């Protein structure tokens, strides 16, 4: 599950949850657990950062990728990977997609698929082996975050 395709599906499932367009039919047990936890983080970040989230105009996918790179470089600067930081990656892509829905020039219905790709690239290349060694999504993330 630490392969790119699995991570891409998690990132895309979370953007479809934020955008209220879940793929008709349903998400896996991993995505279901992740959407509750990442949404709780997302809402608190949006409340705390309300003032500064207006300091950018996310007019394009390249702007969103630049912002994502800056935020992730800062989030992981101490070299510490943990599950909280992994959930924060998904919460942050949720904030990005909401700003793109409002601000993207020539809004493209497939944009969430491009954001999903670069989120999955970051997760796989920068945290993938930490994730696998800590149980992957099914034996790590879900075991940590699934309901008591
Ligand atoms: C006011 C802040 C600001 O100007 N920008 C910004 C910076 C960071 C950010 O989100 C980060 C991800 C969520 C949060 N981290 C966090 O809660 N980490 C905790 C400690 C480790 S843990 O995982 O346990 C939890 C901060 C923002 F959403 C916004 C801007 C930064 C920039 N590079 O311009 C900014 C970025 C993006 C947008 Cl859309 C708007 C402003």
UniProtKB/Swiss-Prot annotation:
InterPro entries per UniProt: Bcl-2-like_sf (IPR036834), Bcl-2_BH1-3 (IPR046371), Bcl-2_fam (IPR026298), Bcl2-like (IPR002475), Bcl2_BH1_motif_CS (IPR020717), Bcl2_BH2_motif_CS (IPR020726), Bcl2A1 (IPR013282)
Gene Ontology cellular-component annotations: cytoplasm; cytosol; mitochondrial outer membrane
SMART domains, per database record: BCL
Tissue: Seems to be restricted to the hematopoietic compartment. Expressed in peripheral blood, spleen, and bone marrow, at moderate levels in lung, small intestine and testis, at a minimal levels in other tissues. Also found in vascular smooth muscle cells and hematopoietic malignancies.
Cross-referenced SUPFAM superfamilies: Bcl-2 inhibitors of programmed cell death
GO biological process, one term: extrinsic apoptotic signaling pathway in absence of ligand
Residue ranges crossing the lipid bilayer per the database entry: none
Positions of short motif BH2: 129-144
Upregulation: By phorbol ester and inflammatory cytokines, such as TNF or IL1B/interleukin-1 beta, but not by growth factors.
UniProt key word Cytoplasm: yes
Residue span of motif BH1: 74-94
Pfam families per UniProt: Bcl-2 (PF00452)
GO molecular function ontology, one term from the record: channel activity
PANTHER family reported in the protein's UniProt record: BCL-2 RELATED (PTHR11256), BCL-2-RELATED PROTEIN A1 (PTHR11256:SF10)
Record function comment: Retards apoptosis induced by IL-3 deprivation. May function in the response of hemopoietic cells to external signals and in maintaining endothelial survival during infection. Can inhibit apoptosis induced by serum starvation in the mammary epithelial cell line HC11.
Subunit and interaction comment: Interacts directly with BAK1, BID, BMF and BBC3. Interacts directly with BCL2L11/BIM. Interacts with BAX isoform Sigma. Interacts directly with PMAIP1. Interacts with RTL10/BOP. Interacts with ING4. Interacts with UBQLN4.
Family to which the UniProt record says this protein belongs: Belongs to the Bcl-2 family.
Protein name: Bcl-2-related protein A1
Name of the gene: BCL2A1
């Amino acid at each position: 599950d630490c392969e790119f395709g699995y991570i891409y599906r998690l990132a895309q499932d979370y953007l479809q949850c934020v955008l209220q367009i879940p793929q008709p039919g349903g998400p896996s047990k991993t995505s279901r657990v992740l959407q509750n936890v990442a949404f709780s983080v997302q809402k608190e970040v949006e409340k705390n950062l309300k003032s500064c989230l207006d300091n950018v105009n996310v007019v394009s996918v390249d702007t969103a990728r630049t912002l994502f790179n800056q935020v992730m470089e800062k989030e992981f600067e101490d070299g510490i990977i943990n599950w909280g930081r992994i959930v924060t990656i998904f919460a942050f892509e949720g904030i990005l997609i909401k700003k793109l829905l409002r601000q993207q020039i020539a809004p493209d219905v497939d944009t969430y698929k491009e954001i999903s790709y670069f989120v999955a690239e970051f997760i796989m290349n920068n945290t993938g082996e930490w994730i696998r060694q800590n149980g992957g999504w099914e034996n790590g993330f879900v075991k940590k975050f699934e309901p008591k």
